[PDB]
Amino acid sequence: MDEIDLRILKILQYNAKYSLDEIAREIRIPKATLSYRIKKLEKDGVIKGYYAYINPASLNLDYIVITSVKAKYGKNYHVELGNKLAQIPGVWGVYFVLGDNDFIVMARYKTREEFMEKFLERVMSIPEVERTSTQVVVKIIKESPNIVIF
Amino acid sequence: MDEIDLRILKILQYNAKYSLDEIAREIRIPKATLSYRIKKLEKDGVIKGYYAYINPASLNLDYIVITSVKAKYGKNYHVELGNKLAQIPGVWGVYFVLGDNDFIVMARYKTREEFMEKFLERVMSIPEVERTSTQVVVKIIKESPNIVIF
Amino acid sequence: MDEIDLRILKILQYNAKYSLDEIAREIRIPKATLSYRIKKLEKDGVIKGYYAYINPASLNLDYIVITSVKAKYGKNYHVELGNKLAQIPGVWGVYFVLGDNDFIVMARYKTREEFMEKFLERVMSIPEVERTSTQVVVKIIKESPNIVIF
Amino acid sequence: MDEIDLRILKILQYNAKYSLDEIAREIRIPKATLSYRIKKLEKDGVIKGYYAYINPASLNLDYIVITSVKAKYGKNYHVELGNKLAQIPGVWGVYFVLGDNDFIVMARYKTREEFMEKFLERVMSIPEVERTSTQVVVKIIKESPNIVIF
Amino acid sequence: MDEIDLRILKILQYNAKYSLDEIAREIRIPKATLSYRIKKLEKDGVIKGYYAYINPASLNLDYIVITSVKAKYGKNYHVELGNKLAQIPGVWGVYFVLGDNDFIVMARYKTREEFMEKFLERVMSIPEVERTSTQVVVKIIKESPNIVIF
Amino acid sequence: MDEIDLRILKILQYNAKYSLDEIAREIRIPKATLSYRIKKLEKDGVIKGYYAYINPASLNLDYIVITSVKAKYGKNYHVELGNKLAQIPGVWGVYFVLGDNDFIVMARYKTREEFMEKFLERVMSIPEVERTSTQVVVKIIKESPNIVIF
Amino acid sequence: MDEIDLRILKILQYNAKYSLDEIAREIRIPKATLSYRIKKLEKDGVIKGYYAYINPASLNLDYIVITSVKAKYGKNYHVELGNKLAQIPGVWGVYFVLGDNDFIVMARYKTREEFMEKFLERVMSIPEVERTSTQVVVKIIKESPNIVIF
Amino acid sequence: MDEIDLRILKILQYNAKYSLDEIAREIRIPKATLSYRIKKLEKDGVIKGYYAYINPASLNLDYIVITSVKAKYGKNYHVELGNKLAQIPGVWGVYFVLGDNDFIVMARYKTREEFMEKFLERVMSIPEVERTSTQVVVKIIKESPNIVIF
């Protein structure tokens, strides 16, 4: 990629439905070239897709959690435990980390009860889990993972 | 919203450039109605936008961190500290949480040095910060915040 | 329930033996209506009972503890462990919680020895327990769980 | 008090509206004597009152928390901080404790937002507070503080 | 015991070889009575013995430790683990405690190597031990366990 | 000192009132020599005194604590803080330690209230104190600091 | 550098006084070329020097510590605090780290007293220090920082 | 050793290739005597070798870690676990320590991936490991283990 590709990506990361004519006018390059560049970025795996940003609040997803997981160590436990956590409905983020915990899990649910049934009751049965500590999110100050270029 | 709106959203959350004809064929409703429903969802704030999912690895964003923040308590410190953390380049997530820490921050950088200059050196000067503990992400097992409907 | 039911409950939560005539005079409604409303609240399960508030100090209950419990995780451990903790004489509160511990237990005893025999020696034998940490209450500043309406 | 007083209290602690005739029949003593004994227990401060046990769930009190507080030490900080915590609407229990924290606070609210406005935003402004850690109650297994005699 | 017994004990707790004539002169009571009182205190188990206070430094006991022990819970583990810890040469204090640890052990050795061989290597083999954390004493500010009356 | 001095000390550390004739018979040395050796040990500071071992339980000292102290760092804080802690009535041991805490304090009181007034309320006013964590002793398995030679 | 430079370095990292003839014979290259390559590595800063590995035990350096430091945050505190720690006699390693602590310090002393005077008493006066936790090394299993190529 | 040996060592610890003539001129002793003294120090094991100080950065060793290890206790676990940790490529320091952890491990790798494959994936399979916490080094302020004489 080059300087122009980054400028294109900087626009698409926050507004993917901005018309080709509008993008071409902003960056200052031929539309045909813009189309070619975007197709290449998709072909090369830089742009992996396009998603609609849906307001979780509109779906009543008010029970937001960040759970730290301590594992029972064993050969390749990170693979086994990581994948089991990733399969839980409501879990959108699973990170293998360095520190006093081994995994950080990001999840969303509508209520305390849903969270207990879909998440807590599933996690407690995973053999690779020693224990977990869930941090309830009182307020989301910022959640814009789509912004990769500042 | 109704059952049909959810099915539309379930598709748009992972593939927003799927054609109207294809979406209409999958859900089984008139294209004109589909267009109307989508426009209403955007007008009502359910769909807040459309973004291109860019592979962070393609931008060499290999230094991924999850930082826990302990604050110096004071009136409305959550607002003041939260906003200062949110303004840091590279920070995409800022959560006010319950537990032994007060904020959880998600950030991405290309290198250790960039992380130190843009993030660590900025955070250490924020008066509302007591201290922080950064968890380095060794491997991202899953990061699909776009999926709001399972 | 309505606004009037709440006012009635606000009185009964701290003084259940206040006469019907006195309550009717305070809220300003017919005694017959007050009686009907109270009976309905009991029938609907809002008022689950009436208790005498006994001063624990009068019973020499001077050894007051708040114990945090870390569990050995397993399928439905919260049910099994929670119920075993709830059965211990002297234990009045058992809460399944989010955080670095899994249960918080509230108990009262007359002495250190009674606490050790009835509580500590029982808890240490429960297989679902990894370990516990007991916080001794030096002084109860406030303990009015009966107040549900502020 | 004597053996008979304890038996009377054991009944009143869970059912204070049980008729005098019924209580007298259960314990086996004259009604006049029972009335005298109860009046004496009230006069002596053993029975401090009578309350209606209201189901918190009926009032939508679904946000239940147990907050640990670390104080900024100073002369008589336990008195000053304890009283400020006790004054917060929704807080029913405040305990000065031994251990890694100095106070344990029990509170109830209807929602996350109410909890943030009435509790979190008030606590963060108290000068005697170093920091706090809130444990969200996922499920109340038992909460019968009225039972003082097992 | 009475006021006079306490005054006698207050003297014997720090100087047991003070002559009977000197003690009688200080407290103001007949020597025969003083002798009788002391014999009674010994007979009743108040005075369990008389020891020479030996300066540990004179024996090169420079490796002073305070070890916290986390146990593997089980029926009567406090008895079993407590006794095994008490049998270790060099260990003079073993306390069953409330908090994040279960036992506190006080020990003294001449060197790091002696401490490792006699204490660490013995403790690591005790099945009731989950783990321990040893706090090395850099300086003893005060160690006068003989003073029971201030 | 020599081998004989150690054997003498091994006896005096647990029974200082054992007669000279009995000690001489046990160790096998002339009484005159034994007396000379003991006087020399006292003169050289090896034997710093003789105390009566008083059973704390006989004095109702049932509230036994081991308190960890975190200090506010500053020049020679260990001297200043250590001495202030050592002056508190009821405190018999004060140790400057390595680890997550800076001092370990051993104290004894008759009741919870005495402990709060004499110890807690005094410690909270010491400026060099950041905070403390008190571990209540449920049972003393062993407390024989007089034994220096095993 | 190339494959040959690495082989040369792999030898020099553990035996720098191995003769040129011996090194040339082992790697299989002309001595003149070996000399040229080594001089270039020194000129380019790859080889920063040559040191004698002295056995710390021979210097009675028996008090080995690894100290974790929590800082008082502020602008560029890592620079200021890091440099002050690095200036302390006996300190050979100072690392700015991610996690619950901010610096890890490696030091060596002959005795507990030397450690207290040269290290502890100096660190406690540094304003940028919140507190520290020192881990005493009981046994060095391995300490070969000179090995950079495995 | 004597005063002169220490002065010789103080020079060799940072510059082992300083010529004999230069060292003799600095310390003020005959070259023949200097040679004899150095040979004796090597023969006596004081000087265990001579190494080239290679700049780790020149080898792209940018992933620097300090890992704390909690062990599963058992007979001689320190020997077994210590040796297994010492065998891992990239690990240069292994210390058996006192405190909340049992071992501190110092290691170096070129990248996050290398660190995960060579270190993390190996450590997680060691049966004697309960868990670990890795502290990533953001900046090395000082790393001069060769300096044994200050």
Ligand SMILES: NC(=O)CC[C@H](N)C(=O)O
């Ligand atoms: N999985 C491992 O090998 C160790 C992970 C652990 N969280 C650490 O930081 O060391």
Ligand SMILES: NC(=O)CC[C@H](N)C(=O)O
């Ligand atoms: N900001 C506050 O009032 C408290 C926040 C803190 N993290 C807690 O869980 O209690």
Ligand SMILES: NC(=O)CC[C@H](N)C(=O)O
């Ligand atoms: N039981 C579970 O699944 C987890 C409970 C744990 N206390 C937490 O907060 O995550």
Ligand SMILES: NC(=O)CC[C@H](N)C(=O)O
């Ligand atoms: N307030 C105090 O003096 C100390 C209280 C502290 N929680 C402790 O356990 O020691």
Ligand SMILES: NC(=O)CC[C@H](N)C(=O)O
């Ligand atoms: N042994 C037990 O039952 C619990 C002991 C633990 N240290 C506590 O404080 O709760």
Ligand SMILES: NC(=O)CC[C@H](N)C(=O)O
């Ligand atoms: N006083 C100091 O300098 C440090 C003491 C601290 N407890 C430690 O272990 O490092």
Ligand SMILES: NC(=O)CC[C@H](N)C(=O)O
């Ligand atoms: N200095 C900083 O900004 C933070 C350092 C802290 N140790 C962390 O891991 O976050």
Ligand SMILES: NC(=O)CC[C@H](N)C(=O)O
């Ligand atoms: N290995 C042991 O016996 C105990 C080691 C532990 N790290 C401690 O400090 O006590």
Ligand SMILES: [Mg+2]
């Ligand atoms: Mg998206």
Ligand SMILES: [Mg+2]
């Ligand atoms: Mg009640």
Ligand SMILES: [Mg+2]
């Ligand atoms: Mg004694």
Ligand SMILES: [Mg+2]
């Ligand atoms: Mg070297």
